């Protein structure tokens, strides 16, 4: 009956790094996605499994707002089926996805002068993540045949590395704060009419 807190997600002061994407649960509220579509601040807005113009016409069981930050070259791989680095070691979207993907420029928000090293991502992992998996654990990658199991070194790589965003960086390599909305088609409580 009350209005959903999409401002608690999109207008958040900061987003967790991609390897530990925040998972805000939205329910027991009436959602108005139109202000999302009609907003002119979104660089991208692509919904899979539902048309963007009919969002405030269906009714959803629950809403999950996976919020994180990646680079401009990495936004393209936030999509079902597509593989890469983000879609294989940080956040793999399921093949049968029924939600939305939102990303907008954040050059003046979370990219400080000289290089903001606050955002991290997983270069290496043993295998590809299952869809909707959070590998927050930071264990030394044993790339080589020597089981070091300790301080990083030769072929013992730290999996978490920083983007290092700068204001002078190119547009294609700039921080795009992604907010993947996920819906499921059962009692439903995050809709209006």
């Amino acid at each position, epitope marked *: 009956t009350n209005l959903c807190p999409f401002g608690e997600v999109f207008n958040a002061t900061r987003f967790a790094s991609v390897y530990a994407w925040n998972r805000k649960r939205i329910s027991n509220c009436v959602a108005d996605y139109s202000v999302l579509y009609n907003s002119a601040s979104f660089s991208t807005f692509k919904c899979y499994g539902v048309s963007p113009t009919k969002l405030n016409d269906l009714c959803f069981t629950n809403v999950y707002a996976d919020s994180f930050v990646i680079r401009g070259d990495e936004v393209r791989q936030i999509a079902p089926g597509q593989t890469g680095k983000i879609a294989d070691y940080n956040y793999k979207l399921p093949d049968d996805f029924t939600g939305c993907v939102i990303a907008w420029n954040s050059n003046n928000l979370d990219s400080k002068v000289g290089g903001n090293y606050n955002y991290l991502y997983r*270069l290496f992992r043993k295998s590809n993540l299952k869809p909707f998996e959070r590998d927050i654990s930071t264990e030394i990658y044993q*790339a*080589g045949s*020597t089981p070091c199991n300790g301080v990083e*070194g*030769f*072929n013992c*790589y730290f999996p978490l*590395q920083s983007y290092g965003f700068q204001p002078t960086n190119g547009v294609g390599y700039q921080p795009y704060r992604v907010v993947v909305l996920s819906f499921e088609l059962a009692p439903a409580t995050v809709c209006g009419p």
Partner: antibody, heavy 123, light 107 residues
Framework: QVQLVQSGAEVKKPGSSVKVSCKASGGTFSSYTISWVRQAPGQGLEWMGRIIPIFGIANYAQKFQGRVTITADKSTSTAYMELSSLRSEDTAVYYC????????????????WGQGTLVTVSS | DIQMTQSPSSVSASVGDRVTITCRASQGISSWLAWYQQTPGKAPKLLIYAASSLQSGVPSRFSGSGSGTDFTLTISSLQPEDFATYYCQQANSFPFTFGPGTKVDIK
């Protein structure tokens, strides 16, 4: 026929810093790990720290950790070594050597080397 | 932290002789090794990697083998060009250590 070319023979006073370079002329940026090796005159080779330009990870030697930092500018394929607070008896002839990288595992055995910036504090 | 040490540096071989240089690792480095060659006024050129795989681009004279800690380098015939210092490093520990240096030279 990959060849590595460094800067000139930098001559800086003790306590300062240098920014010697190493241009990896030839070879893709995802197949070498630039490793810097120093040689004092009359003394055997000594290794400070490697960098992986494609990954960006760069772990150093515990003797030179913090003392020495390395940056790999993949835009122009010229790995940079910064000798912060060059003092004591650091005067040597610093080489740069690329250890081949296969897939994602570093291999070592520095094969292709530079000519060496003879960083010496002398007239 | 693996302090390597070769055979005594003083080696005298005129030409076409057999000069063997052996370096032993303080710790266990399996079969990893990289023998080099310090020509005077030039960068070392890799000779043997992994202690069994001979590097491409150098003669078959520069051969070595071994396992565990005791590693060897053998030269079938000392050509006049090979009047250089020979170094070995490890590929197990990350703080790579080069041996003190065995130099085959005139007296």
């Amino acid at each position: 026929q990959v060849q590595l070319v460094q800067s000139g023979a930098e001559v800086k006073k003790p306590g300062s810093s240098v920014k010697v370079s190493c241009k990896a002329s030839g070879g893709t940026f995802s197949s070498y790990t630039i490793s810097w090796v120093r040689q004092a005159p009359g003394q055997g080779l000594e290794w400070m720290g490697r960098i992986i330009p494609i990954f960006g990870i760069a772990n150093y030697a515990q003797k030179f950790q913090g003392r020495v930092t390395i940056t790999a500018d993949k835009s122009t394929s010229t790995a940079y070594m910064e000798l912060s607070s060059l003092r004591s008896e650091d005067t040597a002839v610093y080489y740069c050597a690329r250890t081949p990288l296969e897939m994602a595992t570093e291999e070592g055995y520095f094969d292709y080397w530079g000519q060496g910036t003879l960083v010496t504090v002398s007239s | 932290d693996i302090q390597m040490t070769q055979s005594p540096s003083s080696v005298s071989a005129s030409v076409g002789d057999r000069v063997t240089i052996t370096c032993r690792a303080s710790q266990g480095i399996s079969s990893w090794l990289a023998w080099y060659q310090q020509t005077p006024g030039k960068a070392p050129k890799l000779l043997i990697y992994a202690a069994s795989s001979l590097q491409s681009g150098v003669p078959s004279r520069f051969s070595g083998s071994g396992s565990g800690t005791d590693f060897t380098l053998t030269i079938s015939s000392l050509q006049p060009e090979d009047f250089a210092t020979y170094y070995c490093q490890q590929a197990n520990s990350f703080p790579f250590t080069f041996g003190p240096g065995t130099k085959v030279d005139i007296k």
